[PDB]
Design an enzyme around this catalytic site. Structure first.
Site, short mmCIF file in Angstrom:
data_model
loop_
_atom_site.label_atom_id
_atom_site.label_comp_id
_atom_site.label_asym_id
_atom_site.label_seq_id
_atom_site.Cartn_x
_atom_site.Cartn_y
_atom_site.Cartn_z
N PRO A 270 -42.80 21.35 88.09
CA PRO A 270 -42.96 19.91 88.35
C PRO A 270 -44.31 19.65 89.03
O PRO A 270 -44.83 20.52 89.72
CB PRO A 270 -41.79 19.59 89.28
N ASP A 271 -44.88 18.46 88.82
CA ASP A 271 -46.17 18.15 89.44
C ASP A 271 -46.00 17.87 90.92
O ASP A 271 -44.90 18.06 91.47
CB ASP A 271 -46.87 16.98 88.75
N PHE A 272 -47.06 17.41 91.57
CA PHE A 272 -46.98 17.16 93.00
C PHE A 272 -46.56 15.77 93.43
O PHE A 272 -45.70 15.62 94.31
CB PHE A 272 -48.33 17.45 93.69
N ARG A 273 -47.13 14.76 92.80
CA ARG A 273 -46.87 13.40 93.23
C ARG A 273 -45.95 12.43 92.50
O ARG A 273 -45.64 11.38 93.06
CB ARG A 273 -48.23 12.75 93.48
N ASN B 187 -55.15 23.70 89.03
CA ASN B 187 -53.92 24.47 89.08
C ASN B 187 -54.20 25.88 89.60
O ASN B 187 -55.33 26.38 89.48
CB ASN B 187 -53.27 24.51 87.68
N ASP C 257 -51.63 28.22 89.02
CA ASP C 257 -50.62 28.93 88.26
C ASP C 257 -51.25 29.91 87.27
O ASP C 257 -50.55 30.70 86.63
CB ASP C 257 -49.73 27.93 87.51
N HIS D 238 -59.40 24.84 92.90
CA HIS D 238 -58.56 24.96 94.07
C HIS D 238 -58.13 26.40 94.38
O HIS D 238 -57.11 26.63 95.04
CB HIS D 238 -57.34 24.05 93.92
#
Ligand code: APR
Ligand code: APR
Ligand code: APR
Ligand code: CL
Ligand code: CL
Ligand code: CL
Ligand code: CL
Ligand code: ZN
Ligand code: ZN
Ligand code: ZN
Lengths: 294, 290, 295
Positions: free
Chosen positions: B46-49, B120, B122, B139
């Site tokens: 799932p994304d963050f926001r 990402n 991941d 990041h």
């Protein structure tokens, strides 16, 4: 690290935002803060704001049978029919309410010598009733300190107009004894120019800000929808190199239109924001005292 | 020409059609992608926001002072447990690349990939077969670890093994300054990897020098800087594409006439872009291979 | 009411329509420019292009297109004109009567207060309402004539139209001087708008610039358009700042949502309601009802 290019998000929780603001001030001691506030910082005091859905003033004026909501405060409408404004003029006078925790924070910031100015659009004068020095309060939309003729601009004392309201059967209204025009308290209406202090002082504080970019200053906007001009044109006139904070229930105005990398938007109630800022600044004590004293 | 009847707000089908067309007109031109959490949502992450489902809206069992505390360097320093607790799930491995990640691999094969700036961690673009030189992990990643104090770098294993320990005893420390050590993924308050600002600095010129380029932004809300500043720094003479469920950032504020905005899920976007480019074959082969 | 006096950007509709009528009253003899789109013909029974579910682009499933706007794209037309031909039949003007908003333009004309009407419609409804051809700019063409998509040769309408009756439409009309396909002069994506559009705007822009001594202050009113298509969508942004803009649409769009100017007057009403309300605030209810009845 915490450099100006370190990872960050513009919209943050109150806890994180206050840490950012507190960090800035601790890192920029001596620096000052310019505040820009609206009806928002007074809802908790018992005074509904103007445009919030359901509870806004402009949504509870059916009684006045106006052509449109804002007519109560439009000169054009006032000339042709002052009954409505007179009918509402009463409740508008200061006195019935006490300052909120946010109003006192301005006082605290003054006692700590970090308040440079407070441009307010409110007319409840709660910022002064809280302790802030007149020298630091710029009541952008006038006040009830006096009245004035909407014709030549003659200035008169409060008492006269305040009197006409008392008497129930609202006879003929206060006229200007020199040109014969309508006279009203000096609170700015749509159509009229704001006081001189507003644009002049802003002109000064704008150079002040440019001078600083030294111990970097902050500008904090809270409790306003930035929907009214020329007040709403201030936030965008802040130099890009000067950090801007917006504590409002919703992102509005220039913060929504041209958000900057260094902007800080906090979707919080002014009092909660005020509480959390004080703690992080480590000024609970001094603040507690200022609160009890009132 | 350029001053003829044209859209700025077209349907998804047409937009995809125009993107593919652009590439066909410029066969030697390459593309630069700028991605975020949105491209790994289908993979199971799932994304963050996003409302309700977003990671930041589901950190309750970590009892944080505020949502972003886990990835905030100041909180970590004074209380690393919550991150250690969450770090287990964040480690790459449990997932496989999405059709969109493979679209990146496909473009590479066709010599059309100039760069992939990703936020990402991941590492799914890498797992999809994209060369490391074309990937920019703005990041950071779990490739190594570092000290939040002196910046000294260490290998992954020490920190990863400490995660296996159930009641996390003492947390990894820097053997030179004694500060806390954590995976080299960027936290709020931390500066980004040199490769980011430096590669962009370079790629920026490459773009201004080629004015025929295309820069495609997908799966990101553009709320985090300095990454978020990337889109607006694209030369006006360069065509920007935004594949995201909602118009965000500089595409919402200072929209440009030539901007293509597609409100679609990245996988369908890719599945469809592959179609208009007439590359259905190689793509399906890659999906099979890997 | 100075240039720096207190004002609201988010005025209510009543106040907005009020301000407009006032501006015209305090600026009699000043003219107004209109920029319009499919929105103003919607009440006439002509669907617009992008409204959810009801827009035209959401109802061409039968034509089996790669994308909706393909029926109006030269690239697609040049490779397969059958879809347009199949549609073209029902696009021709003459089956609808102008809307109140339309007659509102005529009224503005009678009062010698209409400078120009830039329209993206091809329904010729502003004309049918009485607006003079010299005051109408059809930015997106018309069925007045036909042209070759290759050499650009101009032809009469009829040859293309009759070709549409033929049950199995085959062997599409082609330029007898270059071989390329011919179609009615309605603008498709990929084609250049008519010369008079960009040129009339070049003059109207200078006219605006010269009205800002002290000439009566103009006014540009945009209505019934999503501003999704260029170059038309560049007009509202190319309006000088010292000239008030009014947006009458169900939703804020284009340069109004993007770079909204403090002074912009945004009104979310149906164009017909906007007309009635504006006519009332202007005190022109009599000249309007007579124009309406006399139709
Ligand atoms: N407790 C609160 N804390 C923070 N923000 C709040 C709070 N309560 C309301 N707000 C927010 O404050 C704003 C209040 O906006 P307005 O009613 O529009 O008030 P203000 O902007 O100051 O209005 C400007 C001016 O308009 C005139 O009508 C009047 O003259 C006034 O000075 C809104 O955006 C609202 O979400
Ligand atoms: N399948 C999908 N296809 C396209 N867009 C999608 C999809 N799923 C979600 N999206 C959209 O992608 C965006 C993802 O937004 P975010 O949660 O904010 O993610 P991202 O921007 O990459 O977040 C940036 C960064 O914030 C940090 O917290 C974290 O460090 C991260 O790299 C949203 O605007 C969302 O609507
Ligand atoms: N009665 C109405 N009153 C006001 N606004 C209306 C009404 N009905 C619809 N609208 C609004 O009018 C706009 C109609 O937008 P479009 O479909 O996009 O039409 P228009 O802009 O003129 O489209 C431009 C062009 O695109 C091409 O596809 C076509 O060539 C056309 O001229 C929308 O924003 C819609 O909500
Ligand atoms: Cl000072
Ligand atoms: Cl500046
Ligand atoms: Cl540029
Ligand atoms: Cl200009
Ligand atoms: Zn007087
Ligand atoms: Zn160290
Ligand atoms: Zn020809």
């Amino acid at each position: 690290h915490h450099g100006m290019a370190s990872m960050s998000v513009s919209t943050a929780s109150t806890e994180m935002s206050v840490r950012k603001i507190a960090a800035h001030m601790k890192s920029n001691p001596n620096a000052k803060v310019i505040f820009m506030v609206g009806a928002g910082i007074s809802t908790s005091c018992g005074i509904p704001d103007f445009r919030s859905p359901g509870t806004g003033l402009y949504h509870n004026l059916a009684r006045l049978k106006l052509p449109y909501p804002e007519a109560v405060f439009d000169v054009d409408f006032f000339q042709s029919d002052p009954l409505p404004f007179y009918t509402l003029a009463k409740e508008l006078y200061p006195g019935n309410f006490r300052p909120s925790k946010f109003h006192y924070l301005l006082k605290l910031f003054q006692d700590k010598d970090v308040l440079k100015r407070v441009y307010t659009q409110n007319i409840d004068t709660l910022e002064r009733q809280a302790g802030v020095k007149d020298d630091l309060i710029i009541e952008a939309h006038g006040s009830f300190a006096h009245c004035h003729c909407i014709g030549c601009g003659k200035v008169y004392p409060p008492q006269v107009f305040k009197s006409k309201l008392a008497e129930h059967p609202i006879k003929d209204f206060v006229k200007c004894d020199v040109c014969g025009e309508l006279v009203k308290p000096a609170i700015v209406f749509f159509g009229e120019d704001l006081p001189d202090s507003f644009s002049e002082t802003w002109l000064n504080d704008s150079e002040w800000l440019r001078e600083k970019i030294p111990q970097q200053p902050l500008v904090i906007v809270v409790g306003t929808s930035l929907a009214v001009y020329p007040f709403a044109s201030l936030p965008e006139e802040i130099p890009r190199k000067v950090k801007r904070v917006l504590c409002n229930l919703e992102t509005v105005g220039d913060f929504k239109a041209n958000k900057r990398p260094t902007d800080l938007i906090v979707h919080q109630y002014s009092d909660e924001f005020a509480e959390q800022l004080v703690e992080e600044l480590g000024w609970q004590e001094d603040f507690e005292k200022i609160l009890t004293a009132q």
